[PDB]
Write an enzyme that holds these catalytic residues in place. Structure first.
Site, mmCIF file in Angstrom:
data_model
loop_
_atom_site.group_PDB
_atom_site.id
_atom_site.type_symbol
_atom_site.label_atom_id
_atom_site.label_comp_id
_atom_site.label_asym_id
_atom_site.label_seq_id
_atom_site.Cartn_x
_atom_site.Cartn_y
_atom_site.Cartn_z
ATOM 1 C CG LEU A 138 24.282 15.704 -45.061
ATOM 2 C CD1 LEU A 138 23.249 16.075 -44.223
ATOM 3 C CD2 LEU A 138 24.193 16.262 -46.390
ATOM 4 N N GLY A 172 24.207 16.511 -37.927
ATOM 5 C CA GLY A 172 24.808 15.218 -37.292
ATOM 6 C C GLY A 172 25.047 14.238 -38.453
ATOM 7 C CG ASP A 173 24.224 12.531 -42.872
ATOM 8 O OD1 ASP A 173 23.674 11.519 -42.761
ATOM 9 O OD2 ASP A 173 24.856 12.559 -43.942
ATOM 10 C CB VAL A 174 29.002 10.708 -40.549
ATOM 11 C CG1 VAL A 174 30.403 10.042 -41.154
ATOM 12 C CG2 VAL A 174 29.079 10.549 -39.229
#
Length: 218
Positions: free
Chosen positions: A161, A157-159
């Site tokens: 990454l 969910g890391d924008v």
């Protein structure tokens, strides 16, 4: 404690074994690093204080919490002696106070034992952590990396990454989430190390180049 991974680390060699694009990138980007916070409980509290605030903002508020407890926040028992009004006067929001209290409850009841967790599959750690109000999946994941120093974490969910994934495996286009899930399979069990490079790709390199393709014009 600060931890470095060089381009010839066995972790890096593993994550690039079945990914030449990642290899091409790592040889240009060089080493990455992984900050490790000594004290887990302290980290969770600090992580809650940071939500929705700049590093500058959060640092001011946290500085004042340290003064209330009289120095380093190390142990949950220290917060028993500090009231909610006091914490609010320091600038900690009412929701963040509930989350911090819930962290205390979970540490002191023994629900959340950090030594047993250094050992558990990632799947379990994330469960034990997200049980705490205020701690979501992403929060648990960042915590596992930057505070428990666990190398087998991939925060889908890391924008950040996601931006790096598009850059490195799209041509700065495509679905970061899906790219990250698909290509992430290549990096077990050192996914966190890949993620450090993805973040590196998302920052400096993303700003100066469209895609990995562009960068490979020396």
């Amino acid at each position: 404690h600060m931890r470095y991974f060089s381009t010839d680390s066995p972790e890096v060699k593993t994550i690039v074994a079945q990914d030449s694009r990642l290899f091409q990138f790592i040889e240009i980007a060089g080493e990455v690093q992984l900050p490790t916070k000594p004290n887990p409980f302290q980290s969770l509290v600090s992580s809650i204080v940071e939500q929705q605030l700049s590093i500058k903002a959060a640092s001011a508020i946290y500085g004042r919490v340290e003064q209330l407890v009289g120095g380093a926040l190390e142990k949950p028992e220290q917060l028993y002696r500090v009231s909610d009004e006091a914490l609010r006067q320091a600038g900690v929001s009412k929701r963040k106070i509930e989350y911090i209290r819930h962290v205390c409850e979970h540490v002191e009841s023994g629900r959340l034992d950090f030594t047993e967790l250094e050992g558990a599959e990632a799947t379990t750690v994330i469960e034990k952590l997200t049980a705490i109000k205020g701690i979501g999946q992403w929060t648990a994941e960042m915590f596992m990396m930057f505070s428990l120093g666990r190398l087998d974490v991939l925060s889908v969910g890391d924008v950040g990454l996601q931006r790096g994934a598009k850059w490195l495996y799209g041509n700065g286009e495509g679905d970061g989430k899906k790219l990250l899930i698909y290509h992430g399979k290549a990096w077990a069990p050192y996914e966190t190390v890949a993620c450090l490079y993805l973040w590196k790709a998302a920052g400096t390199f993303a700003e100066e180049y469209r895609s990995l393709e562009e960068l490979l014009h020396h």
